[model samples]
Target: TSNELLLPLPNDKLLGDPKAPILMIEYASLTCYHCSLFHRNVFPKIKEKYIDTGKMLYIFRHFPLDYRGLKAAMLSHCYEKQEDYFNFNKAVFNSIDSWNYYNLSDLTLLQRIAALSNLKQDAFNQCINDKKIMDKIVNDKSLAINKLGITATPIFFIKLNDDKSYIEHNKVKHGGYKELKYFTNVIDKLYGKAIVKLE
Candidate 1:
């Protein structure tokens, strides 16, 4: 069963037509192996069909699962300064095995990933130490915990458009692509249109 809604909306956003039939909010942790799997295997398909085509608006919020996950989230925010948010997110997930832990020096690992984004070592270091950015991550996580009731990694909220207003009708916990597909199907039913077909 889905956890009760406890967190407020996160600041992260991917804007599409306001009238889009569906809106998806995903709460994830950087160090979660399952989260990494979703990023590497499942998200690409969702991006191709929903995000690229502007059929759905998607937002991702951080809910770090551990100390290493928090550090990774901080690193991701730093990367966001140098490149697109999605790109940084993808980079972090792609290199999940290498980093995503405090066992190795996070700064050193971040530098290597930053290099992939053409981020200078000095700039990347400065970004990592940026108190303001770190605070934003904390605030976002707090909101998720307080208002959205997110206690674990990879919680999803799927809102479907009613004739008059959007309704939060489905919530999925620790679900992957199959869960995503199920939610999309629910959206199709509410909007009286089939926007997604399972492959």
Candidate 2:
């Protein structure tokens, strides 16, 4: 049922106002190519208009597809502060070319990114090997897969007002690159104020 969509977990990486009219949950993988594309192309606009403006509360959750994505996800939660955590994710997505599944040098570069966030070498390794953190992430992924029936990365659930159920982005249409307009079209319709362009 949709009840699973409404529950909040302690480890959720949150952005935007907590009391915003709309609630958005995104399940994404760090190493997923299209997930990176969404971060690069669509996320900024959503952040600028909805998140920054306090119209929507954005919740980010991990859905790692492999060991590479899993380590990156683990490192993201290592930051003590919320903003630092989001920034770490942004840096990883922006510089995704530097890290890959097969390259050890790439993993070093990923550690350098964590170092910039003040997560030291010792902490970085510890966080990766932390059984507690690993269990949480793996369990969350299992819930998303087995219970929620999610089979891929970058799936989104949007909850509006007091609605009991949420809207699934992919369920609205077939697979394609979901653009800012695609989301805005749905959000603005229910949330009000149709987007207008100036001549």
Candidate 3:
């Protein structure tokens, strides 16, 4: 399907080589408890193992499940650069408990997260108020729920640069820790190594 392509959909952020053989589309909500776990624990190891080696590219998308999650999804775009986006996302995931809608009645917490990521106050403030961000999040979430039949966060949609397969390991489970070897196993099956292992 077209959704399987590595190239990001409009407003979609990615974290790796565009030419990488494996495209991993991550559908997540910043405010989801399970998504938080995957972001804080599983994703970093996958980054180090496959993404750093250019074996896989990832589509980082938000399937905001609630109003606060939508706000978080908006604030995540305060920084335009890939690394900056990643950094801000990490901070958001880390403080999910302390700064989410559960703790506040407004979007102020997201502002502070953007500030922590060093996003310009003016830019951050302006961007967070943009309704376009929420629209994008909704559309992307529709892709997962309507098309992929995904009903939750931390789900991964794996696609091959060359073609699809029948081994059936596409969605890297988001429910628990996915170690380095787990992803490497998938990469090994999807696209053979182009370079030596990083670690």
Candidate 4:
């Protein structure tokens, strides 16, 4: 079942089971440090425990804050497969410091990152310059900002799938998911685990 809250093009990066109990939509910027932190720290555990187990479906929405971020998001679209998209997304954030604050017309630095993922240079070069891709991102950003009251990157909207067990129709948000415990607790609760009171 598709959620109406998901905006923009059909090229959105998605993972996990389509019928998972929890549906999480993430609005993130590639260049944002906090976004990188969430991807670096909390995402792996959630991916392994919740997403992999079919408890959650993760949807990644791009909200690029800078030209570098736009480049990353654009380069991400060059991949056709789910694993390739996932890998490129990781590569962009994993080595973000390598190119985030640089100044240049040539995106050869990012092209190298894509090359690591076996994305051809000519194709990548052509992708970043394509008008349709640029428009899609711009429209996504617009929908995120103008439609939703999104003011920052790494913000999340967690919606539960239609089910009787656990929380029903209860959607929640985290101030941030950088700390591993915060997300683990959310996942724990969703799975009906009794979280011990840690003084």
Task: Give per-model TM-scores.
Answer: 0.75, 0.84, 0.80, 0.83
Worst 10 residues of 4 by lDDT: 190-199
List model 2 lDDT by residue over 18-117, tens digit each: 7677777778888778888889988899889998998888777888877777888887778766677777887877777777547633576677787677
lDDT of each: 0.62, 0.73, 0.69, 0.71
- Give residue 50's lDDT in candidate 4 (0 to 100): 86
Best by TM-score: 2
lDDT of 1 at 181: 78
Q: Which residue pairs show backbone clashes in model 2? A: none
Off by over 4 Å in 3: 1-7, 100-104, 163-180, 193-199
Provide the lDDT at 186 for model 3.
70
lDDT of 4 by residue, 78-119 (tens): 887776787788777887677724464446568778777787
Model 4 scores what on Cα lDDT? Answer: 0.71
lDDT of 3: 0.69
Query: Candidate 1 versus the native: TM-score?
Result: 0.75
Number of clashes recorded per candidate: 6, 0, 0, 0
1 versus 3: better lDDT goes to = 3
Order the candidates by lDDT, highest first.
Answer: 2, 4, 3, 1
- TM-score of model 2 relative to the true fold? 0.84
